[PDB]
Design a protein around this nucleic acid. Structure first.
Ligand SMILES: COc1ccc([C@@]23Oc4cc(OC)cc(OC)c4[C@]2(O)[C@H](O)[C@H](C(=O)N(C)C)[C@H]3c2ccccc2)cc1
Ligand SMILES: Nc1ncnc2c1ncn2[C@@H]1O[C@H](COP(=O)(O)OP(=O)(O)NP(=O)(O)O)[C@@H](O)[C@H]1O
Ligand SMILES: [Mg+2]
Length: 378
RNA sequence: AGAGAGAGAG
């Protein structure tokens, strides 16, 4: 079961070289548990707390299985958003730096002609993509399922949700029967675990009790606002705390992201906005500026709730409380990456603290009123 | 279911 060193995982020498060149020294808890079953070829359901290294868990496993002399697509990774798929593609490339493995990002919003040209020239070893564009390229037969032996759903419970399950099933239908299936997520509700019985062969389940999901290093607070109409002034009062670090402010609708961004611009606050109705070129610019520290404060929808890794984020503001319990863990998990200290602030009206209490009891976690000392916890 | 949030091309 447990293996506490990358040197003890029978990895290729050049793969191990890429891990160490990337900055990793010891495998995290989930890497100690899940990499070997995945490399062995078992179907695996791998759950672990936010920010504990689930990407490299499947990235290392995929890279170790690739036949580099076989110029065909051998592994397919799906993610719910374009920004996450792009982030994963970069991690795979960095860990495979000394291997000569090809990994291509297959996502909506990018130039179709250029991608078709590339795919027809050479079949990448690894595809990381979003379901729409991947299915499109399968349908056009510019991607071939012929040699795909590994199929990974990151954020798997979102990939099996109401809007994604049919998309995943249409892709799975084009895959060979013997394809290995690996699922990863911070959250794995029992209804999701049930449906995995339809397409996974007695998988290895590496699970986490929901009452043990919250990270000790992320202090959760609430701010009484009483009325929705005072949230704007409360956020502006927090601004100089938001900019100590980098902060993400979560909003439940695209429309309100635009509303809040303009209100804060009108008061001369420097903030960036992010949601799915922006052009992909706009989305890429905003994400790049945030990753580089050029912009410190991001107002966004749940587009960025899952998987996005920006080490410098240590503050998450739930301006709107999430209507999905599982989504709460993902949102606050944008801070406190890989053991770092983080803070989550929930802005709660009267009608809201009913929801906050349900969150508290779901995760067996206590969310106290925000202290005046909070700028020092950043 | 739907809404919300995402998720091909044109
Ligand atoms: C012929 O090749 C196709 C390729 C993709 C699609 C789609 O991909 C997207 C992606 C989207 O990002 C904005 C929007 C969208 O529609 C608004 C679509 C779709 O057209 C539509 O929603 C499809 C869907 O889920 N249906 C029918 C219940 C979806 C889909 C994705 C993956 C696998 C199957 C289907 C449709 C056809
Ligand atoms: N073994 C490791 N040693 C050091 N840093 C690591 C290691 N594994 C992962 N990390 C870093 O930890 C951060 C979080 O990794 P990531 O793969 O995004 O976690 P995650 O479990 O997928 N988070 P999430 O999807 O939001 O639940 C990244 O900055 C990684 O580079
Ligand atoms: Mg992740």
């Amino acid at each position: 079961e447990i293996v506490d060193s990358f040197d003890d995982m029978n990895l290729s020498e050049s793969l191990l070289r890429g891990i160490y060149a990337y900055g990793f020294e010891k495998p995290s808890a989930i890497q100690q548990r899940a990499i070997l079953p995945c490399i062995k070829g078992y179907d695996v359901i791998a759950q672990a707390q936010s920010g504990t290294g689930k990407t490299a868990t499947f990235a290392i496993s995929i890279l170790q299985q690739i036949e580099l002399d076989l110029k065909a697509t051998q592994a397919l990774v799906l993610a719910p958003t374009r920004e996450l798929a792009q982030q994963i593609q970069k991690v795979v490339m960095a860990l495979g730096d000394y291997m000569g493995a090809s990994c291509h990002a297959c996502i909506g919003g990018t130039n179709v002609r250029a991608e078709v040209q590339k795919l027809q020239m050479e079949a990448p070893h690894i595809i990381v993509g979003t379901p729409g564009r991947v299915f499109d390229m399968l349908n056009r037969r510019y991607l071939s399922p012929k040699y795909i032996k590994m199929f990974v759903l990151d954020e798997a419970d979102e990939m099996l949700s109401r809007g994604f399950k049919d998309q995943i099933y249409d892709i799975f239908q084009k895959l060979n029967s013997n394809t290995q299936v690996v699922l990863l997520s911070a959250t794995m509700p029992s209804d999701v675990l049930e449906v995995t019985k339809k397409f996974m062969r007695d998988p290895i389940r590496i699970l986490v009790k929901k009452e043990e999901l919250t990270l000790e290093g992320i202090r959760q607070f609430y701010i009484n606002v009483e009325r929705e109409e005072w949230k704007l002034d409360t956020l502006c009062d927090l601004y100089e705390t938001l900019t100590i670090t980098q902060a993400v402010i979560f909003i439940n609708t695209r429309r309100k992201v635009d509303w809040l961004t303009e209100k804060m611009h009108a008061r001369d606050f420097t903030v960036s906005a992010m949601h799915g109705d922006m052009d992909q070129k706009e989305r890429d610019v905003i994400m790049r500026e945030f990753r580089s520290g050029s912009s410190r404060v991001l107002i966004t929808t749940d587009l960025l709730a899952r998987g996005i890794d920006v080490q410098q984020v240590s503050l998450v503001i739930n301006y709107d409380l999430p209507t999905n319990r599982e989504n709460y863990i993902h949102r606050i998990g944008r801070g406190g990456r890989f053991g770092r200290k983080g803070v989550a602030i929930n802005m709660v009206t009267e009608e809201d603290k009913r929801t906050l209490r349900d969150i508290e009891t779901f995760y067996n976690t206590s969310i106290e009123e925000m202290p005046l000392n909070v700028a020092d916890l950043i």
